[PDB]
Motif scaffolding. Structure first.
Motif: not given
Ligand SMILES: Nc1ncnc2c1c(-c1ccc(C(=O)Nc3cc(C4CC4)ccn3)cc1)nn2[C@@H]1CCCN(C(=O)C2CC2)C1
Length: 265
Positions: A115-129, A136-148
């Motif tokens: 979300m800090e990368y999206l902030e720097s691109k002036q790109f909003l999610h609008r439904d972050l939840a 993924n398989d290594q337990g890392v969390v990632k954001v998706s469906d931004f701006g959808m």
């Protein structure tokens, strides 16, 4: 970029999401991918297709990487990085007794970085939840469906009082004026942190959306989760300032998170 389905394989059904069925497969052999078939009749396609070309240039380790699309047929295909552990909301609930608070804070750092990368691109999610974050398989969390949500035709999903509007993640200025900003994504991130440390409980489970909206407007805030330290709670609580400008940016937020992680050593 456009993808010839010739270079795709459908290997498994993952289920129907907010925007249509998704399947697991392989792209160009070496890429584990998740192919979404955009539900027909749900999206403003031309606007959505043209905007997909903009969201393609967004890249970040903590963003579900987009590889391409198949648009010269319907339903549109969307080819994305495969997140083996699925939605963050369901990952949290099934593995409730397998998380130490160190792993939970990590999950917040992952999202905040994205979300800090999206902030720097002036790109909003609008439904972050949590329902829009994947693991993924290594337990890392990632954001998706931004701006959808900008291209959803159903007015219930878009209007402030719509039966499908995410009131429980919305800031007061989104409910009363529909003023979306990175500050509204910050409020939503606060709620997301509460989801994570609550191990997937529905925020304000026993409030109608209206009941939630009015209580939020008058100062109600989610209770401190049991696994959250008062320092973690202080961070998610700062996302919920009534005044948007009083809320810390994701950059200021990520630093605070790392300060807490360092103090958990
Ligand atoms: N990648 C996955 N890996 C594993 N599972 C995955 C996914 C996905 C997926 C697929 C595509 C997308 C996408 O297109 N984002 C996007 C596109 C754009 C394009 C306009 C430029 C812009 C911004 N975000 C986002 C998520 N969905 N799913 C399951 C679906 C059913 C429910 N799910 C569960 O886990 C429940 C069973 C527990 C998750």
């Amino acid at each position: 970029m456009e993808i010839d389905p010739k270079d795709l394989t459908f290997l498994k059904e993952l289920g129907t999401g907010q925007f249509g069925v998704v399947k697991y497969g392989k792209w160009r052999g070496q890429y584990d991918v998740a192919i979404r078939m955009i539900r027909e009749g749900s999206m403003s396609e031309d606007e959505f297709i043209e905007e997909a070309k903009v969201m393609m240039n967004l890249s970040h380790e903590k963003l579900v990487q987009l590889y391409g699309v198949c648009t010269k047929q319907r339903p549109i295909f969307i080819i994305t990085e495969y997140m083996a552990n699925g939605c963050l909301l369901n990952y949290l609930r099934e593995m409730r007794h397998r998380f130490q608070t160190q792993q939970l804070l990590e999950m917040c750092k992952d999202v905040c970085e994205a979300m800090e990368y999206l902030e720097s691109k002036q790109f909003l999610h609008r439904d972050l939840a949590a329902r829009n974050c994947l693991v993924n398989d290594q337990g890392v969390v990632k954001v998706s469906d931004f701006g959808m949500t900008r291209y959803v035709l159903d007015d219930e999903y878009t209007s402030s009082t719509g039966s499908k509007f995410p009131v429980k993640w919305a800031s007061p200025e989104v409910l009363m004026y529909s003023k979306f900003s990175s500050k509204s994504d910050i409020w939503a991130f606060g709620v997301l942190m509460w989801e994570i440390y609550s191990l997937g409980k529905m925020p304000y489970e026993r409030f109608t959306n209206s009941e939630t909206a009015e209580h939020i407007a008058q100062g109600l805030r989610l209770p401190r989760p049991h696994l959250a330290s008062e320092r973690v709670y202080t961070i998610m609580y700062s996302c919920w300032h009534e005044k948007a400008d009083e809320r810390p940016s994701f950059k200021i937020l990520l630093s605070n998170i790392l300060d807490v992680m360092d103090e958990e050593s």
